[PDB]
Amino acid sequence: DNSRYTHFLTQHYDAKPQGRDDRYCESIMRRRGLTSPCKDINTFIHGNKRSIKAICENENGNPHRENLRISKSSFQVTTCKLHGGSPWPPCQYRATAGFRNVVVACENGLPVHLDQSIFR
């Protein structure tokens, strides 16, 4: 069963963004189905998939907290943060581009959860 890995990619992977601005967030959050209701915070990892999967092995990860894993490499990321009063669309997002390691949970060598706490 690789459905959670697939869902992880949908929610948290975007290989090649250009401008990672507010409009980038507002578009990709719609495109990936994260706007009913508006997700309060969501981060996308850029670059290749193989580096992300590698966090699940010694190659690019260490154990972290309770059964999570933290990457050794740094990733280009973009965090989309909801603003405005309402939980419901249209969903306005503020983009914050960043470059650091990421925390995930892995199952059968595949990432299945991104820990959003490090981007808050």
Numbering used by the authors: 2 to 121
Quote the authors verbatim.
Angiogenin (ANG), a 14-kDa basic protein is an angiogenic ribonuclease and member of the bovine pancreatic ribonuclease (RNase A) family (also known as RNase 5). Like RNase A, ANG cleaves preferentially on the 3′ side of pyrimidines and follows a transphosphorylation/hydrolysis mechanism. In addition, the crystal structure of human ANG has revealed that it has an RNase A fold and the catalytic triad (residues H13, K40 and H114) is conserved. The enzymatic activity of ANG is several orders of magnitude lower than that of RNase A towards conventional RNase substrates, but essential for its angiogenic effect.
